[PDB]
PDB file of C-alpha atoms and ligand atoms in Angstrom:
ATOM      1  CA  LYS H   1       7.020   6.338-183.428  1.00 15.74           C
ATOM      2  CA  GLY H   2      10.214   4.305-183.092  1.00 18.33           C
ATOM      3  CA  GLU H   3      10.739   3.224-186.733  1.00 20.77           C
ATOM      4  CA  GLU H   4      11.719   6.808-187.719  1.00 24.99           C
ATOM      5  CA  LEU H   5      14.960   6.507-185.707  1.00 26.00           C
ATOM      6  CA  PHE H   6      16.137   3.595-187.897  1.00 26.42           C
ATOM      7  CA  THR H   7      15.857   5.035-191.435  1.00 25.58           C
ATOM      8  CA  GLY H   8      19.609   5.660-191.698  1.00 24.68           C
ATOM      9  CA  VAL H   9      22.958   4.459-190.314  1.00 25.29           C
ATOM     10  CA  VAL H  10      22.844   4.286-186.493  1.00 24.16           C
ATOM     11  CA  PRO H  11      26.003   3.845-184.331  1.00 21.68           C
ATOM     12  CA  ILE H  12      26.010   0.947-181.845  1.00 20.49           C
ATOM     13  CA  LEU H  13      27.773   0.359-178.521  1.00 22.03           C
ATOM     14  CA  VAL H  14      27.716  -3.076-176.880  1.00 21.33           C
ATOM     15  CA  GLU H  15      28.891  -3.681-173.300  1.00 21.21           C
ATOM     16  CA  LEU H  16      28.924  -7.117-171.682  1.00 22.09           C
ATOM     17  CA  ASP H  17      29.839  -8.117-168.124  1.00 23.76           C
ATOM     18  CA  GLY H  18      30.101 -11.880-167.736  1.00 22.80           C
ATOM     19  CA  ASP H  19      30.738 -14.698-165.281  1.00 22.99           C
ATOM     20  CA  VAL H  20      30.878 -18.303-166.528  1.00 21.00           C
ATOM     21  CA  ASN H  21      31.806 -20.892-163.833  1.00 23.87           C
ATOM     22  CA  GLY H  22      33.561 -18.172-161.817  1.00 25.66           C
ATOM     23  CA  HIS H  23      35.566 -16.923-164.817  1.00 24.52           C
ATOM     24  CA  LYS H  24      34.990 -13.165-165.053  1.00 26.79           C
ATOM     25  CA  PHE H  25      35.194 -11.327-168.385  1.00 28.93           C
ATOM     26  CA  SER H  26      34.165  -8.128-170.183  1.00 27.49           C
ATOM     27  CA  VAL H  27      33.404  -7.453-173.850  1.00 32.39           C
ATOM     28  CA  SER H  28      33.233  -4.035-175.532  1.00 32.22           C
ATOM     29  CA  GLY H  29      31.692  -3.671-178.973  1.00 29.14           C
ATOM     30  CA  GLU H  30      31.496  -0.823-181.477  1.00 26.58           C
ATOM     31  CA  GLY H  31      29.936  -0.574-184.912  1.00 28.86           C
ATOM     32  CA  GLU H  32      26.814   0.381-186.837  1.00 28.19           C
ATOM     33  CA  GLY H  33      23.450  -0.874-187.983  1.00 29.17           C
ATOM     34  CA  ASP H  34      21.390  -0.048-191.062  1.00 30.58           C
ATOM     35  CA  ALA H  35      17.885  -1.468-190.552  1.00 31.62           C
ATOM     36  CA  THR H  36      16.887  -0.629-194.157  1.00 30.84           C
ATOM     37  CA  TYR H  37      19.122  -3.546-195.254  1.00 29.43           C
ATOM     38  CA  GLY H  38      18.931  -5.353-191.884  1.00 29.47           C
ATOM     39  CA  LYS H  39      22.697  -4.946-191.735  1.00 29.79           C
ATOM     40  CA  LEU H  40      24.973  -5.110-188.695  1.00 30.40           C
ATOM     41  CA  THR H  41      28.740  -4.461-188.839  1.00 30.09           C
ATOM     42  CA  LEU H  42      30.555  -4.752-185.520  1.00 31.27           C
ATOM     43  CA  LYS H  43      33.840  -5.299-183.814  1.00 31.24           C
ATOM     44  CA  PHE H  44      33.933  -6.808-180.317  1.00 34.08           C
ATOM     45  CA  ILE H  45      37.000  -6.805-178.022  1.00 34.88           C
ATOM     46  CA  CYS H  46      37.654  -8.895-174.901  1.00 34.00           C
ATOM     47  CA  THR H  47      38.838  -6.219-172.555  1.00 34.89           C
ATOM     48  CA  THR H  48      39.806  -8.475-169.814  1.00 36.02           C
ATOM     49  CA  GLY H  49      42.090 -10.542-171.948  1.00 37.68           C
ATOM     50  CA  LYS H  50      41.424 -13.984-173.447  1.00 36.31           C
ATOM     51  CA  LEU H  51      37.806 -15.158-173.168  1.00 38.12           C
ATOM     52  CA  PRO H  52      36.963 -18.310-171.118  1.00 42.22           C
ATOM     53  CA  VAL H  53      34.142 -19.115-173.567  1.00 43.96           C
ATOM     54  CA  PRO H  54      34.213 -19.332-177.426  1.00 42.64           C
ATOM     55  CA  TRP H  55      33.203 -16.195-179.343  1.00 41.76           C
ATOM     56  CA  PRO H  56      30.290 -17.904-181.241  1.00 41.33           C
ATOM     57  CA  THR H  57      28.485 -18.649-177.926  1.00 40.59           C
ATOM     58  CA  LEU H  58      28.198 -14.893-177.335  1.00 41.51           C
ATOM     59  CA  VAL H  59      26.691 -13.767-180.696  1.00 39.39           C
ATOM     60  CA  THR H  60      23.018 -14.021-179.642  1.00 40.11           C
ATOM     61  CA  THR H  61      23.710 -12.061-176.441  1.00 40.53           C
ATOM     62  CA  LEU H  62      25.789  -9.358-178.186  1.00 39.72           C
ATOM     63  CA  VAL H  63      20.069  -5.704-181.136  1.00 40.43           C
ATOM     64  CA  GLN H  64      17.077  -7.048-183.070  1.00 41.06           C
ATOM     65  CA  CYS H  65      15.835  -3.477-183.601  1.00 39.69           C
ATOM     66  CA  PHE H  66      18.093  -3.524-186.670  1.00 41.51           C
ATOM     67  CA  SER H  67      16.117  -6.339-188.290  1.00 42.69           C
ATOM     68  CA  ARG H  68      14.672  -5.531-191.706  1.00 40.28           C
ATOM     69  CA  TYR H  69      10.920  -5.684-191.422  1.00 45.49           C
ATOM     70  CA  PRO H  70       9.388  -5.661-194.939  1.00 46.22           C
ATOM     71  CA  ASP H  71       6.838  -2.853-195.505  1.00 49.56           C
ATOM     72  CA  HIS H  72       3.926  -5.258-195.329  1.00 47.73           C
ATOM     73  CA  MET H  73       5.079  -6.433-191.928  1.00 47.01           C
ATOM     74  CA  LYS H  74       5.905  -3.038-190.314  1.00 46.52           C
ATOM     75  CA  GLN H  75       2.966  -3.280-187.874  1.00 47.18           C
ATOM     76  CA  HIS H  76       4.694  -6.370-186.387  1.00 43.80           C
ATOM     77  CA  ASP H  77       7.940  -4.652-185.354  1.00 44.44           C
ATOM     78  CA  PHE H  78       8.038  -4.673-181.536  1.00 42.47           C
ATOM     79  CA  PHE H  79      11.756  -3.873-181.356  1.00 43.65           C
ATOM     80  CA  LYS H  80      11.680  -0.463-183.053  1.00 41.23           C
ATOM     81  CA  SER H  81       8.333   0.484-181.449  1.00 41.86           C
ATOM     82  CA  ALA H  82       9.882   0.333-177.950  1.00 41.28           C
ATOM     83  CA  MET H  83      12.478   2.950-178.979  1.00 43.98           C
ATOM     84  CA  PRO H  84      13.865   5.518-177.799  1.00 42.62           C
ATOM     85  CA  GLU H  85      13.092   4.325-174.220  1.00 42.95           C
ATOM     86  CA  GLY H  86      13.990   0.774-175.183  1.00 35.81           C
ATOM     87  CA  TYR H  87      13.423  -2.768-174.004  1.00 38.04           C
ATOM     88  CA  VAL H  88      14.723  -5.342-171.542  1.00 37.65           C
ATOM     89  CA  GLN H  89      15.875  -8.589-173.198  1.00 35.29           C
ATOM     90  CA  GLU H  90      16.177 -11.689-170.999  1.00 34.16           C
ATOM     91  CA  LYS H  91      17.441 -15.037-172.282  1.00 35.21           C
ATOM     92  CA  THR H  92      18.106 -18.525-170.956  1.00 37.97           C
ATOM     93  CA  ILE H  93      20.556 -20.258-173.275  1.00 40.53           C
ATOM     94  CA  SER H  94      20.637 -24.011-172.575  1.00 43.03           C
ATOM     95  CA  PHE H  95      23.631 -25.824-174.090  1.00 41.91           C
ATOM     96  CA  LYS H  96      22.754 -29.502-174.657  1.00 41.15           C
ATOM     97  CA  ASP H  97      24.647 -31.854-172.293  1.00 46.08           C
ATOM     98  CA  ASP H  98      26.333 -28.800-170.726  1.00 45.32           C
ATOM     99  CA  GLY H  99      25.577 -25.642-168.726  1.00 43.52           C
ATOM    100  CA  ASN H 100      23.478 -22.533-169.284  1.00 44.80           C
ATOM    101  CA  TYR H 101      23.644 -18.866-169.813  1.00 47.05           C
ATOM    102  CA  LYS H 102      21.230 -16.450-168.026  1.00 43.44           C
ATOM    103  CA  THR H 103      21.364 -13.055-169.720  1.00 46.14           C
ATOM    104  CA  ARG H 104      19.750  -9.731-168.886  1.00 46.59           C
ATOM    105  CA  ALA H 105      20.134  -6.791-171.231  1.00 45.90           C
ATOM    106  CA  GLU H 106      18.818  -3.259-171.600  1.00 45.68           C
ATOM    107  CA  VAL H 107      18.709  -2.032-175.213  1.00 43.89           C
ATOM    108  CA  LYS H 108      18.035   1.696-175.662  1.00 38.35           C
ATOM    109  CA  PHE H 109      19.147   4.957-177.245  1.00 40.61           C
ATOM    110  CA  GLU H 110      21.793   7.059-175.527  1.00 38.27           C
ATOM    111  CA  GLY H 111      21.564  10.161-177.677  1.00 37.17           C
ATOM    112  CA  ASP H 112      21.724   9.074-181.321  1.00 38.29           C
ATOM    113  CA  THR H 113      23.564   5.870-180.391  1.00 37.30           C
ATOM    114  CA  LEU H 114      21.842   2.518-179.814  1.00 36.39           C
ATOM    115  CA  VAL H 115      23.298   0.809-176.746  1.00 39.28           C
ATOM    116  CA  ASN H 116      23.148  -2.825-175.582  1.00 37.59           C
ATOM    117  CA  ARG H 117      24.225  -3.250-171.919  1.00 38.14           C
ATOM    118  CA  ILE H 118      24.370  -6.925-170.875  1.00 36.12           C
ATOM    119  CA  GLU H 119      24.925  -8.959-167.701  1.00 34.92           C
ATOM    120  CA  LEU H 120      25.706 -12.631-168.451  1.00 36.94           C
ATOM    121  CA  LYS H 121      25.766 -15.452-165.887  1.00 40.41           C
ATOM    122  CA  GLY H 122      26.921 -18.918-166.919  1.00 40.98           C
ATOM    123  CA  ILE H 123      26.562 -21.905-164.594  1.00 39.65           C
ATOM    124  CA  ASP H 124      27.128 -25.696-164.483  1.00 41.47           C
ATOM    125  CA  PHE H 125      29.540 -25.942-167.412  1.00 44.38           C
ATOM    126  CA  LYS H 126      31.759 -28.998-167.856  1.00 43.84           C
ATOM    127  CA  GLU H 127      35.519 -28.334-167.537  1.00 44.98           C
ATOM    128  CA  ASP H 128      36.361 -29.986-170.740  1.00 46.84           C
ATOM    129  CA  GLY H 129      33.013 -29.622-172.441  1.00 47.79           C
ATOM    130  CA  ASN H 130      32.541 -27.892-175.817  1.00 48.25           C
ATOM    131  CA  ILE H 131      32.293 -24.450-174.224  1.00 48.61           C
ATOM    132  CA  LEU H 132      35.002 -24.353-171.491  1.00 48.87           C
ATOM    133  CA  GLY H 133      37.234 -26.642-173.560  1.00 48.00           C
ATOM    134  CA  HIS H 134      37.044 -24.261-176.588  1.00 49.91           C
ATOM    135  CA  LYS H 135      35.953 -26.989-179.021  1.00 49.72           C
ATOM    136  CA  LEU H 136      33.697 -24.794-181.167  1.00 46.26           C
ATOM    137  CA  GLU H 137      34.627 -23.667-184.680  1.00 48.37           C
ATOM    138  CA  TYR H 138      34.928 -19.973-185.440  1.00 48.27           C
ATOM    139  CA  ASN H 139      31.881 -19.761-187.726  1.00 46.16           C
ATOM    140  CA  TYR H 140      28.107 -19.326-187.520  1.00 46.82           C
ATOM    141  CA  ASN H 141      25.096 -20.987-189.126  1.00 47.70           C
ATOM    142  CA  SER H 142      21.883 -19.390-190.425  1.00 43.18           C
ATOM    143  CA  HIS H 143      18.878 -19.555-188.061  1.00 45.19           C
ATOM    144  CA  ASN H 144      15.219 -18.581-187.660  1.00 47.91           C
ATOM    145  CA  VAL H 145      14.099 -16.682-184.531  1.00 47.89           C
ATOM    146  CA  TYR H 146      10.423 -17.534-183.909  1.00 46.36           C
ATOM    147  CA  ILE H 147       8.636 -14.594-182.301  1.00 46.10           C
ATOM    148  CA  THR H 148       5.240 -14.630-180.566  1.00 45.45           C
ATOM    149  CA  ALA H 149       3.327 -12.008-178.529  1.00 44.30           C
ATOM    150  CA  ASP H 150       3.350 -11.801-174.716  1.00 47.83           C
ATOM    151  CA  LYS H 151       0.313  -9.552-174.166  1.00 46.22           C
ATOM    152  CA  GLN H 152       0.505 -10.012-170.365  1.00 43.46           C
ATOM    153  CA  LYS H 153       3.946  -8.355-170.136  1.00 39.27           C
ATOM    154  CA  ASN H 154       3.237  -6.003-173.116  1.00 39.87           C
ATOM    155  CA  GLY H 155       6.113  -7.559-175.048  1.00 41.54           C
ATOM    156  CA  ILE H 156       7.338 -10.595-176.954  1.00 45.18           C
ATOM    157  CA  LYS H 157       8.776 -14.081-176.491  1.00 44.43           C
ATOM    158  CA  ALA H 158      11.204 -15.865-178.829  1.00 44.19           C
ATOM    159  CA  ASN H 159      12.037 -19.552-179.192  1.00 45.67           C
ATOM    160  CA  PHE H 160      14.960 -20.762-181.323  1.00 43.68           C
ATOM    161  CA  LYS H 161      17.688 -23.406-181.574  1.00 43.45           C
ATOM    162  CA  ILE H 162      21.267 -22.389-182.382  1.00 47.83           C
ATOM    163  CA  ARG H 163      23.606 -25.059-183.742  1.00 47.63           C
ATOM    164  CA  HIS H 164      27.304 -24.403-183.037  1.00 45.54           C
ATOM    165  CA  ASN H 165      29.715 -26.410-185.222  1.00 48.48           C
ATOM    166  CA  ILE H 166      32.184 -28.435-183.104  1.00 45.99           C
ATOM    167  CA  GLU H 167      35.776 -29.042-184.383  1.00 46.94           C
ATOM    168  CA  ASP H 168      35.155 -32.795-184.919  1.00 46.70           C
ATOM    169  CA  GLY H 169      32.223 -32.274-187.295  1.00 46.24           C
ATOM    170  CA  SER H 170      29.489 -32.685-184.639  1.00 47.37           C
ATOM    171  CA  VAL H 171      27.070 -29.969-183.400  1.00 48.87           C
ATOM    172  CA  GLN H 172      26.421 -28.264-180.053  1.00 49.80           C
ATOM    173  CA  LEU H 173      22.762 -27.365-179.676  1.00 50.03           C
ATOM    174  CA  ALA H 174      22.061 -24.132-177.791  1.00 49.74           C
ATOM    175  CA  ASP H 175      18.343 -23.832-176.982  1.00 47.68           C
ATOM    176  CA  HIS H 176      17.176 -20.232-176.588  1.00 48.79           C
ATOM    177  CA  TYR H 177      14.153 -18.929-174.691  1.00 47.74           C
ATOM    178  CA  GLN H 178      13.831 -15.155-175.001  1.00 50.60           C
ATOM    179  CA  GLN H 179      11.543 -12.635-173.295  1.00 52.93           C
ATOM    180  CA  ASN H 180      11.376  -8.896-174.120  1.00 50.34           C
ATOM    181  CA  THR H 181       9.588  -6.204-172.069  1.00 46.41           C
ATOM    182  CA  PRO H 182       9.455  -2.415-172.824  1.00 47.36           C
ATOM    183  CA  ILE H 183      11.200   0.039-170.447  1.00 45.00           C
ATOM    184  CA  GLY H 184       8.859   2.927-171.288  1.00 45.54           C
ATOM    185  CA  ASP H 185       5.118   3.223-170.664  1.00 44.26           C
ATOM    186  CA  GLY H 186       4.328   4.190-174.272  1.00 44.21           C
ATOM    187  CA  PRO H 187       2.365   1.916-176.703  1.00 44.30           C
ATOM    188  CA  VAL H 188       4.277  -0.871-178.456  1.00 42.43           C
ATOM    189  CA  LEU H 189       3.489  -3.143-181.390  1.00 45.97           C
ATOM    190  CA  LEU H 190       2.224  -6.603-180.376  1.00 44.73           C
ATOM    191  CA  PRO H 191       3.029  -8.927-183.334  1.00 42.71           C
ATOM    192  CA  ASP H 192       1.474 -12.009-184.882  1.00 42.99           C
ATOM    193  CA  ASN H 193       3.632 -15.151-185.107  1.00 44.18           C
ATOM    194  CA  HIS H 194       6.613 -14.617-187.421  1.00 48.15           C
ATOM    195  CA  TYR H 195      10.365 -15.164-187.614  1.00 47.71           C
ATOM    196  CA  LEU H 196      13.665 -13.369-188.161  1.00 48.14           C
ATOM    197  CA  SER H 197      15.927 -15.035-190.750  1.00 48.89           C
ATOM    198  CA  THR H 198      19.492 -14.482-189.623  1.00 50.09           C
ATOM    199  CA  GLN H 199      22.837 -14.897-191.331  1.00 49.53           C
ATOM    200  CA  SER H 200      26.126 -14.217-189.524  1.00 49.90           C
ATOM    201  CA  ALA H 201      29.732 -14.108-190.761  1.00 48.41           C
ATOM    202  CA  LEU H 202      32.619 -14.075-188.274  1.00 50.45           C
ATOM    203  CA  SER H 203      36.165 -12.890-189.069  1.00 53.92           C
ATOM    204  CA  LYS H 204      39.311 -11.378-187.527  1.00 55.18           C
ATOM    205  CA  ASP H 205      41.033  -7.999-187.887  1.00 54.87           C
ATOM    206  CA  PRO H 206      44.513  -8.650-189.115  1.00 54.69           C
ATOM    207  CA  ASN H 207      45.991  -5.640-187.147  1.00 53.18           C
ATOM    208  CA  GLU H 208      44.360  -6.547-183.807  1.00 54.92           C
ATOM    209  CA  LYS H 209      46.427  -8.337-181.118  1.00 52.78           C
ATOM    210  CA  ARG H 210      43.702  -8.429-178.428  1.00 53.95           C
ATOM    211  CA  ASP H 211      41.092 -11.237-178.336  1.00 53.44           C
ATOM    212  CA  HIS H 212      38.358 -10.049-180.716  1.00 52.48           C
ATOM    213  CA  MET H 213      35.474 -10.788-183.111  1.00 48.81           C
ATOM    214  CA  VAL H 214      34.465  -8.978-186.301  1.00 51.81           C
ATOM    215  CA  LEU H 215      30.794  -9.631-187.089  1.00 53.83           C
ATOM    216  CA  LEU H 216      28.819  -9.073-190.305  1.00 52.04           C
ATOM    217  CA  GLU H 217      25.147  -9.901-189.766  1.00 49.68           C
ATOM    218  CA  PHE H 218      21.981  -9.749-191.903  1.00 49.28           C
ATOM    219  CA  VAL H 219      18.567 -10.094-190.245  1.00 47.31           C
ATOM    220  CA  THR H 220      15.267 -10.132-192.188  1.00 48.07           C
ATOM    221  CA  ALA H 221      11.716 -10.641-190.875  1.00 45.95           C
ATOM    222  CA  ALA H 222       9.417 -13.145-192.638  1.00 46.06           C
ATOM    223  CA  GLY H 223       6.616 -15.432-192.112  1.00 49.49           C
ATOM    224  CA  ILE H 224       3.666 -13.091-192.819  1.00 51.38           C
TER     225      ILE H 224
HETATM  226 MG1  LIG U   1      24.543 -26.449-158.313  1.00 54.23          MG
END
């Protein structure tokens, strides 16, 4: 069973390959997760130089297997149940009055390390919009990720709305439609309707000169 692999501190590697309106970029992330406290501590670096999109727009794309599922809700943890073979996570992120991100990721164990390999494709963004014009504040709000079962594809679906704070006090709504499917042919946990309560804190490393993001995240399952 997959939950046994998450009882302690597990190292994480995140690799993103992106293209937003022709602008190519790569992000490399390193850190660790401790599912017992639903804690994520990571440092992401833009390996290609300065990013053409704001760092907050990439948080949801950049490992829900580290969510803390209370003991009474363990039978509803799809994410850990798909491990070690892993799962495919596909998202369509629709930014209100702007373009969209279509992401495809494979989340799985590579030895004792949990890896998140992502391909991101962004299209139809406005040149001076909130995203390409870098008008988003370097912070993150607390959200609820509503999960439901997709018994047809032996996985789950998630529907949530992310609100990015704009520099003028307004908000940029980023509608998310998620779909997860297991890579392996082993039995997975099909959950009842519930949500993941998320809290994210963004910061910078004072000694780092490259474009980066330090992320402290806490994810807890609720709702049942
Ligand atoms: Mg077109």
